[PDB]
Amino acid sequence: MIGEITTFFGMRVFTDEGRYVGRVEDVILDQNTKSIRGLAISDYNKALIDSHAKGVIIPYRVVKAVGDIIIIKDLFKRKSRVLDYESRELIE
Amino acid sequence: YVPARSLARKSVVLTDGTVVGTLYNITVDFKTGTIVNLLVKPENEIPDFKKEEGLYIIPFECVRSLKDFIVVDRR
């Protein structure tokens, strides 16, 4: 549970649905709340992230487990908008 | 907000100006995400911080800024 910050470095991140997210490149800190703010990710999965940045930042609150890998809540999905005259829902 | 690697081996100083050492590592809780300690490679002999494996154990409660010099107080 408690350990050193260097452990994050190089760890692969997966979602709790088994899907690869990427490799931790850095850890984003906050003096005001004495807490980890986010994880900087690189070598990141294009199938899941539409983005052209060198790396992306995942907020730390979606981290579920840190072991040999980091598991996060799978947030790489699309919500469906509700339609008033259709029981089906829309995706754009 | 500060990336952790940008704190790599920075110098750590007290409120008066004493050079405490160079940052070695950072202790954190992985579930909570709370930052717990600093681990500073010593250079001077401040009695205000206890030691383990030859590093200063600075509670993160005592950190007061983290710009070009890590600044630390006794309380």
- Secondary structure (H, E, C), chain A: CEEEHHHHCCCEEEECCCCEEEEEEEEEEECCCCEEEEEEEECCCCCCCCCCCCCEEEEHHHEEEECCCEEECCCCCCCCEEECCEEEEECC
Whether chain A has a CB inside 8 Å of the CB on B73: the answer is: no
Cβ-based contacts of A5 with chain B (< 8 Å): 4, 25-28
Which CATH homologous superfamily contains domain B5-72? PRC-barrel domain (2.30.30.240)
Least Cα distance to B43 among B10, B19, B69 occurs for B19
Distance of CA A65 to the CA centre of its chain: 12
Cβ-based contacts of A34 with chain B (< 8 Å): 34-35, 60-61
Q: Is the dihedral of CA A20, A44, A64, A25 positive or negative?
A: positive
- Domain boundaries in chain B? 5-72
Within 10 angstroms of residue B32's Cβ, the number of other Cβ atoms is 13
Radius of gyration, CA atoms only, chain A: 16
| Closest CB from B1, B29, B39 relative to A1 | B29
Radius of gyration, CA atoms only, chain B: 12
| Three-state SS at B73 | coil
Burial environment of residue B48 by CB neighbours within 10 A (0 to 12, 13 to 18, 19 or more): middle
Distance from CA of A79 to the nearest CA of B (A): 28
Q: What is the DSSP letter of B10?
A: -
Q: Is the dihedral of CA B22, B25, B29, B34 positive or negative?
A: positive
Domain that holds residue A25: 5-90
Cβ-based contacts of A6 with chain B (< 8 Å): 25
| Closest CB from A6, A9, A28 relative to B1 | A28
Least Cα distance to B4 among A10, A64, A8 occurs for A8
The span from the CA of B58 to the CA of B36, in Å, is 9
Cα–Cα distance list, A3 to B2, B13, B29 (Å): 19, 24, 6
Residues 6+ apart with CB under 8 A from A3: B27, B28, B30
Task: Tokens for A42, please give them.
Answer: 């690189």
Q: Tell me how the structure was determined.
A: X-ray
Strand partners, B40: B23, B56
Distance from CA of B46 to the nearest CA of A (A): 23
The span from the CA of A77 to the CA of A49, in Å, is 10
Give the residue carrying structure tokens 């754009």: A92
Provide the residue type at B62 as one letter. C
What CATH number is associated with residue A19?
2.30.30.240
Contact call for A5 and B30, based on CB within 8 A: no
Number of folded domains in chain A?
1
